Amino acid sequence: GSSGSSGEKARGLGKYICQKCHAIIDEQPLIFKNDPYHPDHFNCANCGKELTADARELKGELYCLPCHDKMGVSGPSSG
Ligand SMILES: [Zn+2]
Ligand SMILES: [Zn+2]
């Protein structure tokens, strides 16, 4: 037969485990540096509010959609 062992199955579909507090992430898991995290742990840098799971990163930092949107604004844009 197959040297060793064969015959195991598992479907423990839980949720994203926060790589910070090691606690289930019911809500959308905040991905940072290729790792799950809570969007409540970190806070914006501009306003200073509770970031979100879809919080965009800026040079290592993390800003909230609200602020982030108020960043990509300008008049005459030339690619
Ligand atoms: Zn956490
Ligand atoms: Zn903000």
**Domains of the chain by residue range:** 1-79
Within 8 A by CB and 6+ apart from 16, the residues are 24, 25, 29, 36
- Name the helix (H) or strand (E) containing 16: none
**Distance from Cα 1 to the centre of ligand 1, integer Å:** 45
**Distance from Cα 25 to the centre of ligand 2, integer Å:** 22
**Distance from Cα 41 to the centre of ligand 1, integer Å:** 6
Across 1-79, the runs of DSSP E, i.e. the strands, are 56-58, 61-63
- Name the helix (H) or strand (E) containing 65: helix 65-69
For 1-79, CATH number out of 3.40.50.150, 1.10.150.300, 2.10.110.10, 3.20.10.10 equals 2.10.110.10
Method of structure determination: NMR
Residues 44 and 51 sit within 8 Å (Cβ to Cβ)? yes
Please give the Cα distance from 23 to 37 (Å, whole number): 9
Residues flanking ion ligand 1, Cβ below 5 Å: 18, 20-21, 38
Dihedral sign from CA coordinates of 32, 52, 54, 12: positive
**Distance from Cα 51 to the centre of ligand 2, integer Å:** 7
User: Residue 33's Cα: distance from chain center in Å?
Assistant: 8
Residues 18 and 29 sit within 8 Å (Cβ to Cβ)? yes
Residue 58 DSSP label:
E
Residues 55 and 62 sit within 8 Å (Cβ to Cβ)? yes
- The phi, psi pair for 24, rounded to 5°, reads -35, 145
